[PDB]
Design a protein around this nucleic acid. Structure first.
Ligand SMILES: [Mg+2]
Ligand SMILES: [Mg+2]
Ligand SMILES: [Mg+2]
Lengths: 145, 64, 143, 68, 55, 75, 57, 189, 144
RNA sequence: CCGAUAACGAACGAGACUCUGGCAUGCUAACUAGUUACGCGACCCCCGAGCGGUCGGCGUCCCCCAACUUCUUAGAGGGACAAGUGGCGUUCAGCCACCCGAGAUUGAGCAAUAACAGGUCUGUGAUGCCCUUAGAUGUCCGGGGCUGCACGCGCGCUACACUGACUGGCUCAGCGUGUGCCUACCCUACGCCGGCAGGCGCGGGUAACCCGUUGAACCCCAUUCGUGAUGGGGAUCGGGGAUUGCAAUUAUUCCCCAUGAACGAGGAAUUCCCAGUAAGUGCGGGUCAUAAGCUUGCGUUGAUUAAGUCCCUGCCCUUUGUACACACCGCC
């Protein structure tokens, strides 16, 4: 009841292969995982069915292992297929949500496959320019100098 | 050595001064000694009949 | 005293009605309540997990205040400013599906019905219970 | 500031005072009433400006001769 | 010249579909109230239509 | 003016001091109590409402942008 | 009326017709002392009267 | 009797200096139930004096773009500030506000055109209208610059700026700028 | 105690926000748009709406029955139009059905408190010109 | 304008004028605007209210079955003139202040004599002269380009945060558009399906009849966040879905999930502005198969400072100099 810090608390704690804060709210603290935003964190925690007002160190270890399974395998846990990151993948055609350095692997893969096929988007990516059709006469000068 | 602060009552406004009109010449007599009337240069919109604080008595207002 | 909903504070009245609909289990909810966004201009899910009962409570007094309010009327009512990112803000309407689900749920609850023209209106039992809860919440508010 | 009259209203007031003096008066409403009928002013604005100047000159002439 | 490609380009919309009803220019065309008029032309004929700068 | 690093929750040293010293000074507000005890501020609001439900203070304003509490009147 | 058009477009169309008519009559009777033209439109018929210097011409 | 914000009678107040006595509108006829009345007090000269002072407080409070049209927010701000100062002092919030205004008002300033070629800063006195304007402006901007980057709220900082100005505690923003202005007035009097 | 047809209808408007009060004989009660003034939406201005009745007290409001309908404008304009509608309707009903020798001592309180309670504010808006964002603000310019 | 006064009497521009806005419980009238009262209800009420209350529920032009215009609409008019009074002034033009008054300077349009070798031949079947005219600088179709980036300048939007952000709830606008001669392109309520962007079926509106009682934003009320480049910011970038079109890649637009960059109030410099004004804040029109970060209009919330000056920056007038008169881009 708005009590002191319990003994079973972690102020910095490890999830997958990266650490997340403890003082933050439980949903906002886990968005630091590279690939999950506020909406995904909130929906997977609502499916985790726990107290949302408690911080990240008040999450007991069984709740840790509970939330990570949901966040890793959303499609079995009634998460809508339109909610996911890798909808209709170009490799397997199977929806998934990519997290941490897995997302880094996927993005690097997209860049290098576009580079291999020598598409205009891939060439713009390699040259570091803009890829979404916007102008380049006046902007980007911070990144260029 | 420091002169005591007192008040002066505006009798009438003489004109605008300060090379930009920012100041306003006024004729004021102290209610403490109603015989003595001096010109002072004020800062801000001042009407006739209002009073204002004066930190000194000897000092008068020159042009500008 | 004959107390009508127009005689009571709406901030308290809405939560009173939502509490009543929470008490009565006849009202139905869709399974996607905890997942979907309430509008195009919303940036986050609603904080309350009873937001559906809140929505029904709001639209109940809205249809009481004026009838003929269809799904589009509900979405215009519940619409809000869209931040548009870097573009200047604008107005966007609410979700059509959430208005459809709430109005159809009230219709199944059978205190609202389709009119001789478009839109829906309260049954007399609807305002009967609305003024009942308004009277009891007014008594609790005053004393 | 900016309430000065014009020569068009001033001269017409002078002429009507000099020609029809006896009928005029010291009431503005009366002055505009007589002016409305004995003079042809297309506009109400010009009409009552003429009447006001006529009244002011009436106040002047009742206590001192003027250029009129 | 050949019948098929002399007009094969669709111009059922866009700026090429419409033109000024006075000078056939497609720039600054005013389509309000079905005017369909080049602006420098409408400023010329404004009095005739009945448009008056009341203010 | 380099870092705050406030306590998100209480401990042994802070909870007892809050309980013993809060009902003495005139101004009982979430921001002021956060300044005094280096607490987070969500915790300050929660602790203020828990102390109000304990009865060691009385509510004053209760506005959605800022609440005011005050020490008990002595009599 | 779905076949009929808005009153705004009606007045716009009539003004456009008057302008085109006046321009064409100018370019047609410039040497004939063209001065002006007017139209009285009634549902029965329209009467167009042309003011010129030499109506014999 | 007037009960601005439902309390804090304005009949028990007083002004120590006649110069601001006729230029403060906290009196019974210029006492309003709320600090919100657009009576067109800027239409001609010297009408902001007839404007009630607590209206002026929110008037000078709403500044700096993000809140430039909001009067209701500044009204609830002055409401909460009055509540806070009365809780932590016990005397009349309006009376202590008047005392804060009087303490903060800079009696002298400079003209900056004391000579034509070079800046000279001839020291001159201040009309009472400029006095009240400078005082309220300094207080409002003092609260603004007190609570821009902290947990401390605008109502709290307006309250304690008024308290510090009333007591002349030398740490208030308005008091400090007044002190600096008097210092430069003596510097180039 | 049974005189019928004792009714007036007095409007009050400011900034394209009109509010008409229908005043008639009845029990002392108040309602704007079918809800009491105490249950108004911007309650931070609720003292402005209860201000006219607290001026002369409920004693002269005990024998009156008034209902107001409001349309147009925004919230603050609605508030000001409502209060001036209330004051004007009360003073007009009073002057109509009883003597003005006692209407003076209620009109003078209103005028000495705030002229807007009986005289509407004429200022509405100014036109935006094609040189800048608004009525008098102009667009930027650069010489270099 | 007054006043001196070899000038008097005029004329144009200014003013005047037209429109705009506030005031008329005065007039003219309104089932394409309504308001009261009445009769049906519907519900709250019975402690008892009972001529109790709410209804943008239904009617009293469903025509015999009520009135009126207060609200709205727009015509005729009126109304404000420094009119009254105190003071200043040559006591003149006028100025300041105050009462009564809705209003004691509302905004605009038009704008002289002239000049700028100012801009436009790319607005024109306006136009002299010249260039080209069949391997066309005519014209049509296809593709690209008009977007392209070491850097520099201008107009803008977005923020930098707790005076805030998020969630929900309460909640009030006015300008104004809306189905097409070419020309195939309208505005849209309601019901259903989708989470969204969208799709389907039924209508209404060529318009004070429908969209629409324009349920807007901002703001207001509660919760959560907590000084952390943080739940501020959403730049960049990935994956996926719909819309328009013949065609979307150089991403047309919009939607969902993803990364979260700079940015912590801005050096020298410099813009705009006096009352419903700056500003914040949305909404219409123009653009349009698709569309606004632009612009033109409207509405909401709504201030600070000043009633002055020639210090700066420009402009005019008088005097003056001139060897200039093609008029200093001069002459020599
Ligand atoms: Mg003129
Ligand atoms: Mg993203
Ligand atoms: Mg010589």
């Amino acid at each position: 009841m708005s009590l002191v810090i319990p003994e079973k608390f972690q102020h910095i704690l490890r999830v997958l292969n990266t650490n997340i804060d403890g003082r933050r709210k439980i949903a906002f603290a886990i968005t630091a995982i590279k690939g999950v935003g506020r909406r995904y964190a909130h929906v997977v925690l609502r499916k985790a069915d726990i107290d949302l007002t408690k911080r990240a160190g008040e999450l007991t270890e069984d709740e840790v292992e509970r939330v990570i399974t949901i966040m890793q395998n959303p499609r079995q846990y009634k998460i809508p297929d339109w909610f996911l990151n890798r909808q209709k993948d170009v490799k397997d055609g199977k929806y998934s949500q990519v997290l941490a350095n897995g997302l880094d692997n996927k993005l690097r893969e997209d860049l290098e496959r576009l580079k291999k096929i020598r598409a205009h988007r891939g060439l713009r990516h390699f040259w570091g320019l803009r890829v979404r059709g916007q102008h380049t006469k006046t902007t980007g000068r911070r990144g260029r100098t | 050595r420091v002169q005591p602060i007192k008040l002066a009552r505006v009798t009438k406004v003489l004109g605008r001064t300060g090379s930009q009109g920012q100041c306003t010449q006024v004729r004021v007599e102290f209610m403490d000694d109603t015989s003595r009337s001096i010109i002072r240069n004020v800062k801000g919109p001042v009407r006739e009949g209002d009073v204002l604080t004066l930190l000194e008595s000897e000092r008068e207002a020159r042009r500008l | 005293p004959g107390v009508t909903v127009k005689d009571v504070n709406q901030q308290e009245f809405v939560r009173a009605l939502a509490a009543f609909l929470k008490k009565s289990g006849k009202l139905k909810v869709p399974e996607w309540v905890d997942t979907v966004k309430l509008a195009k201009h919303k940036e986050l899910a609603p904080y309350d997990e009873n937001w559906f009962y809140t929505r029904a409570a709001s639209t109940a007094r809205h249809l009481y205040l004026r009838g003929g309010a269809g799904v589009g009327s509900m979405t215009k009512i519940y619409g809000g400013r869209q931040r548009n990112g870097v573009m200047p803000s604008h107005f966007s309407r609410g979700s059509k599906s959430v208005a459809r689900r709430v109005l159809q749920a009230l219709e199944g609850l059978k205190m609202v019905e389709k009119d001789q023209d478009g839109g829906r209106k309260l049954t007399p039992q609807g305002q009967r219970d609305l003024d009942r809860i308004a009277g009891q919440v007014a008594a609790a508010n005053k004393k | 500031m900016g309430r000065v009259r014009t020569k068009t209203v001033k001269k017409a007031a002078r002429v009507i005072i000099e020609k029809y003096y006896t009928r005029l008066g010291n009431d503005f409403h009366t002055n505009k009433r007589v002016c409305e009928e004995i003079a042809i002013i297309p506009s109400k604005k010009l009409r009552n400006k003429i009447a006001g100047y006529v009244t002011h000159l009436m106040k002047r002439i009742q206590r001192g001769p003027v250029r009129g | 010249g050949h019948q098929q490609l002399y007009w094969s380009h669709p111009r059922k919309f866009g700026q090429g579909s419409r033109s000024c009803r006075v000078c056939s220019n497609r720039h600054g065309l005013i389509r309000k109230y079905g005017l369909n008029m080049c602006r420098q032309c409408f400023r010329q004929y404004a009095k005739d239509i009945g448009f008056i700068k009341l203010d | 003016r380099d870092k705050l690093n406030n306590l998100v929750l209480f401990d042994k040293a802070t909870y007892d001091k809050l309980c013993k010293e809060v009902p003495n000074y005139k101004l009982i507000t979430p921001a002021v109590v956060s300044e005094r005890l280096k607490i987070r501020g969500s915790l300050a609001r929660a602790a203020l409402q828990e102390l109000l439900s304990k009865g060691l203070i009385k509510l004053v304003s209760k506005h959605r942008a800022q609440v005011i509490y005050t020490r008990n009147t002595k009599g | 009326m779905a076949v009929q058009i808005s009153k705004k477009r009606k007045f716009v169309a009539d003004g456009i017709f008057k302008a085109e008519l006046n321009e064409f009559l100018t370019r047609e009777l410039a040497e004939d002392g063209y001065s002006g033209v007017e139209v009285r439109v009634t549902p029965t018929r329209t009467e167009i009267i042309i003011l010129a210097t030499r109506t014999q011409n | 009797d007037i009960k601005l914000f439902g309390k804090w009678s304005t009949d028990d107040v007083q002004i120590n200096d006649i110069s601001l006595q006729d230029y403060i509108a906290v009196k019974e006829k210029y006492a309003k139930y709320l600090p919100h009345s657009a009576g067109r007090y800027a239409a001609k000269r010297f009408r902001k004096a007839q404007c009630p002072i607590v209206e002026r407080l929110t008037n000078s409070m709403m500044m700096h773009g993000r809140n430039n049209g909001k009067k209701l927010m500044t009204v609830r701000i002055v409401k909460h500030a009055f509540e806070i100062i009365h809780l932590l002092t016990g005397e009349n919030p309006l009376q202590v506000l008047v005392n804060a205004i009087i303490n903060s008002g800079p009696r002298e300033d400079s003209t900056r055109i004391g000579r034509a070629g070079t800046v000279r800063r001839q020291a001159v006195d201040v009309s009472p209208l400029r006095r009240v304007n400078q005082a309220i402006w300094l207080l409002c901007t003092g609260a603004r610059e007190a609570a821009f980057r902290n947990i401390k709220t605008i109502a709290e900082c307006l309250a304690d700026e008024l308290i510090n100005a009333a007591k002349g505690s030398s740490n208030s923003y308005a008091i400090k700028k007044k002190d600096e202005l008097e210092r430069v007035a003596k510097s180039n009097r | 105690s049974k005189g019928p047809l004792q009714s007036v209808q007095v409007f009050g408007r400011k900034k394209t926000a009109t509010a008409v009060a229908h005043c008639k004989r009845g029990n002392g009660l108040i309602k704007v748009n079918g809800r009491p003034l105490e249950m108004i939406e911007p309650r931070t201005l609720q003292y402005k709406l209860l201000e006219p009745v607290l001026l002369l007290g409920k004693e002269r409001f005990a024998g009156v029955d008034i209902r107001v309908r409001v349309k147009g404008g925004g919230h603050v304009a609605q508030i000001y139009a409502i209060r001036q509608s209330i004051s004007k309707a009360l003073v007009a009903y009073y002057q109509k059905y009883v003597d003005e020798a006692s209407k003076k001592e209620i009109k003078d309180i209103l005028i000495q408190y705030d002229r807007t309670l009986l005289v509407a504010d004429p200022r509405r808006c100014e036109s935006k010109k094609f040189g800048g964002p608004g009525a008098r603000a102009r667009y930027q310019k650069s010489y270099r």
